[PDB]
Amino acid sequence: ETSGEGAVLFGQHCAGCHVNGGNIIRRGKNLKLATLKRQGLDSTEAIASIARKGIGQMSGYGDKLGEGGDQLVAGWILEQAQNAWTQG
Numbered sequence: 001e002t003s004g005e006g007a008v009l010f011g012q013h014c015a016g017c018h019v020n021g022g023n024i025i026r027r028g029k030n031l032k033l034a035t036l037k038r039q040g041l042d043s044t045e046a047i048a049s050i051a052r053k054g055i056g057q058m059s060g061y062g063d064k065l066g067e068g069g070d071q072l073v074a075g076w077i078l079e080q081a082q083n084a085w086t087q088g
C-alpha cells in the first residue's frame with residue numbers, strides 16, 4: 001500500500017550485495033528472472049522466504065525487515081526481475 005516501502009527495504013538490507021539485480025558474492029546467484037526461474041524462485045513467496053531465512057551462503061534478514069517486510073521487498077525484486085532491472 002505504501003509507495004516505495006519494498007524498494008527502501010531493498011536499499012537498506014539487500015542492495016549492498018544485489019544492486020541492479022546482481023550478486024557481488026556468488027555472481028551466478030543473481031536476481032535476474034531467468035536465474036530465479038531456473039531454480040524455481042520466480043515468485044514473491046520464494047524470494048520472501050530467502051529474504052526471511054537466507055539460503056546457502058546468504059543469511060536471513062527477517063529479524064530486520066519488519067512484519068511482512070520479506071513480502072514487500074520480494075514483490076519489488078520480482079517486478080524488477082520482470083523488467084530486467086531497467087526502466088525508462
Ligand code: HEC
Pocket residue numbers: 010013014015016017018023025026028029030031035036039041046047050051055056057058061073074077
Ligand atoms: C551479501 C552479504 C548479501 C546480502 C546483503 C543479501 N544477499 Fe541475497 N544472496 C547472497 C548470496 C551469497 C546468495 C547465494 C546463496 C547461495 O549459496 O546460493 C544470495 C542469494 C539470494 C537469492 C537467490 C538468488 C539465486 O538463486 O539466483 C535471493 C532471492 C536473494 N539473495 C535475496 C535477497 C534479499 C531479498 C536480500 C535483502 C533482504 C538479500 N538477498 C541480501 C548474498 C546477499
Ligand code: NA
Pocket residue numbers: 083084085086087
Ligand atoms: Na527493462
